[PDB]
Write a protein that binds this DNA or RNA. Structure first.
Ligand SMILES: [Mg+2]
Ligand SMILES: [Mg+2]
Ligand SMILES: [Mg+2]
Ligand SMILES: [Mg+2]
Ligand SMILES: [Mg+2]
Ligand SMILES: [Mg+2]
Ligand SMILES: [Mg+2]
Ligand SMILES: [Mg+2]
Ligand SMILES: [Mg+2]
Ligand SMILES: [Mg+2]
Ligand SMILES: [Mg+2]
Ligand SMILES: [Mg+2]
Ligand SMILES: [Mg+2]
Ligand SMILES: [Mg+2]
Ligand SMILES: [Mg+2]
Ligand SMILES: [Mg+2]
Ligand SMILES: [Mg+2]
Ligand SMILES: [Mg+2]
Ligand SMILES: [Mg+2]
Ligand SMILES: [Mg+2]
Ligand SMILES: [Mg+2]
Ligand SMILES: [Mg+2]
Ligand SMILES: [Mg+2]
Ligand SMILES: [Mg+2]
Ligand SMILES: [Mg+2]
Ligand SMILES: [Mg+2]
Ligand SMILES: [Mg+2]
Ligand SMILES: [Mg+2]
Ligand SMILES: [Mg+2]
Ligand SMILES: [Mg+2]
Ligand SMILES: [Mg+2]
Ligand SMILES: [Mg+2]
Ligand SMILES: [Mg+2]
Ligand SMILES: [Mg+2]
Ligand SMILES: [Mg+2]
Ligand SMILES: [Mg+2]
Ligand SMILES: [Mg+2]
Length: 124
RNA sequence: GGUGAAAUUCUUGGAUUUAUUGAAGACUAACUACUGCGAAAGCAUUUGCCAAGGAUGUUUUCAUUAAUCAGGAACGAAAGUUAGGGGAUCGAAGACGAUCAGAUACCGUCGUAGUCUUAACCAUAAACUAUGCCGAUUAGGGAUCGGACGGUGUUAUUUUUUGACCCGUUCGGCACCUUACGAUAAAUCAAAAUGUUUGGGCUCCUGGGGGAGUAUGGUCGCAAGGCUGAAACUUAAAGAAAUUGACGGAAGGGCACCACCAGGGGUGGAGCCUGCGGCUUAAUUUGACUCAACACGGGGAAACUCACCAGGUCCAGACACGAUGAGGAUUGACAGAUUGAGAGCUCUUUCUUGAUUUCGUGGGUGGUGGUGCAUGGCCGUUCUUAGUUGGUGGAGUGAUUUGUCUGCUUAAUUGCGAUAACGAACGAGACCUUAACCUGCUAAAUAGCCCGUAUUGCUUUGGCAGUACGCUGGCUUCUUAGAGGGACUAUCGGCUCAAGCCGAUGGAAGUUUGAGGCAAUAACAGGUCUGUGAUGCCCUUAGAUGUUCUGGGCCGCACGCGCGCUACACUGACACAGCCAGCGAGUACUCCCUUGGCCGGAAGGUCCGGGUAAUCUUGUUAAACUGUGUCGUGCUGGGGAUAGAGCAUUGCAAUUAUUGCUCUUCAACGAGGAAUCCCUAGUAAGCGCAAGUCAUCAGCUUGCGUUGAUUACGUCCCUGCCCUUUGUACACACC
């Protein structure tokens, strides 16, 4: 079968992890890319590397792949992480719906001032 | 009926099967559980009676009455014994039927004791939790059984109790799950912990393996036997738990035409070569004996090769010492006769050299002599499959293990991934050679094409391999050969997270594009001492196991085997005609490849010449094959074995025919038993050619081309291989 070896996969990932904007989905252009940037001196190996590189580039157009950054993702996950809604989900805006034992803890701890709504506790 | 398949057996007297009923004896299915009771052995239908028991609860009683126990006693599965009853089923022994070499067994049909019960014995089980009884302490957790307690809500009853279910606490049980502050040699253990920091109480047993739970004595038993229980003698291990391999008629997964399936072509059925043993001895030189010996030693031996007799040769015994020795000492070669002899070896004479030499003592050289079980090197094989190894980290006291893997994927330890491993090195792949593409580049009189010149034959009206190196201006499609490009699964449709897989399109090429080369760790007592001045040791070294010469032998022939050639014909044989390749080789002290002319029936002979090679042999005009005829279903014009005669060639030599040609002779063989080999596309098969060997001989091998298929594209059934789990009493490793 035609299963590519690690020397092809690992090298191609380094190409994508570094030269993503220069690469594209065209094999013929990707063929010329490997000429300038890599030192293969083996037409079969270079064709395999360009062929496997093109395969992942078409995969990138869908959201995959894990573990091959591709720094354009890195800058993207930065802005995903920084995102935050202005209204906290912990806001009480019926304010705090807890049970009999929880409110008892508030009395014990000396904080019997929270707008606590005591709910019943039963077993079905 | 019964079985892997059968048979013994029953059956038209109705077997087996169907329904109803009856009798007999045994047993108590499903419910049935990591549940219960009992001191253990054991105990599973209902009901009644009889006696007993643990746990629970207790603000009841006694007050040390307790624990363990040598002898002693009760109970004690199954089998077995005695005397009755019963006797359905099953079933020791026994009889048959199969299987098998045997089958006193496993398998099947019968079948006695027994299996069941009352009375009386027996007292042993892998009677096991292989783990004595009492007591205290020590990590967590959830189930479950019995009792008790507290709470909650449904459900059935109820003058609000009780049962079922739910949650929790506690006592007492059967167990279980994770962990190691601990234990052990380890497997593993909440006990096998609280033990070299060694003492809570009591009883029993053991002291390397056998002999041996045997002999004897005692005692119990109706008996079978039980309990108690040695010694002589023998032996360096036996044994326990784990580890890595190997093996398995163990399981899971995956592969291979040196495996099979579907097929194709063979071999095994005479004769050829000795390719392999007896016989002759000078010998039929010798090595190799499953794959991994037997057209192998590139081993197609006339002489040589040669290693298997005779005859000679060796200061082809270097060098050192001594003697013959300075009256010359030493020493060899000729001629005739004998002696094969062409060594004067013998009868004689000539030269002769002077310690170049001849003997003796040491020491060397040579040996296709032995040892491949002393070795190097090389090759083959394990093993053509995908496997192997450190470093740091983790587990284990240790051998060692993880890394190197559950799953999917791949031809692949190939990847995607999971992950006490991370990061790497080999092998695979990658790489190199070769085949297929380029009307793109480079450039060719040692390759071609077009153009033109001269000329030939028909037409003469334009067409012919037409023919002709300095006959030629241009070009490189064909040919040659360098750089390059080209395929990377490209695109599309599906499955899938991925790795990838299937189909179609385009493309010269889509199985890794086809075929090879190289090819890891470890090993074999694999082969080679007969390749080597590559060698250790042993043997021999003047009547040689050195060397050379003649002849013979390696070929000898009742017999068995292996690799092959030709055939058993009509899809054919023969005669003419048509008529197309590729890989290659070729001349110096002597002829290598050979053209053309001449002679001959053929093999051949002769003469002038070409080629040290894209130039000449050579377009190697190969064969198979196609066309037209003869033959005719006859072992026949198939087949060419054996043999007779003659003629040439190579060689110094052809006899046991080297080989070639002509005529004649015309054997088995009509498709091949039990068995067995190779093979998936330009492949099998058929057909030939060149090279190696070579003065001559190719039925052999290495390559090349021509014609060119049937059938899978799957599997683990046979034979083997790879990985994992598992078992092992194996490690010389299932021979
Ligand atoms: Mg009947
Ligand atoms: Mg019960
Ligand atoms: Mg029952
Ligand atoms: Mg009671
Ligand atoms: Mg006992
Ligand atoms: Mg015991
Ligand atoms: Mg205790
Ligand atoms: Mg309990
Ligand atoms: Mg309870
Ligand atoms: Mg219990
Ligand atoms: Mg002892
Ligand atoms: Mg003992
Ligand atoms: Mg053991
Ligand atoms: Mg196959
Ligand atoms: Mg075979
Ligand atoms: Mg077959
Ligand atoms: Mg021979
Ligand atoms: Mg083999
Ligand atoms: Mg010969
Ligand atoms: Mg000879
Ligand atoms: Mg050897
Ligand atoms: Mg060797
Ligand atoms: Mg390590
Ligand atoms: Mg370590
Ligand atoms: Mg350690
Ligand atoms: Mg290849
Ligand atoms: Mg050798
Ligand atoms: Mg000799
Ligand atoms: Mg001789
Ligand atoms: Mg052979
Ligand atoms: Mg044949
Ligand atoms: Mg003919
Ligand atoms: Mg030609
Ligand atoms: Mg020849
Ligand atoms: Mg040969
Ligand atoms: Mg076992
Ligand atoms: Mg052993």
């Amino acid at each position: 079968g035609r299963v590519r070896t690690k020397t092809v996969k690992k090298s191609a990932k380094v190409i994508i992890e570094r030269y993503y904007p220069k690469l594209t989905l065209d094999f013929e252009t990707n063929k010329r890319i490997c000429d300038e940037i890599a030192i293969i001196a083996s037409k079969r190996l270079r064709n395999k590397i360009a062929g496997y590189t093109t395969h992942l580039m078409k995969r990138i157009q869908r959201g995959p792949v894990r573990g091959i950054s591709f720094k354009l993702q890195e800058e993207e996950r930065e802005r995903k992480d920084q995102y935050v809604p202005e209204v906290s989900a912990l806001d009480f805006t019926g304010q705090l719906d807890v049970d009999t034992e929880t409110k008892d803890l508030l009395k014990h701890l000396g904080f019997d001032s929270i707008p606590v709504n005591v709910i019943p506790v039963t077993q079905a």
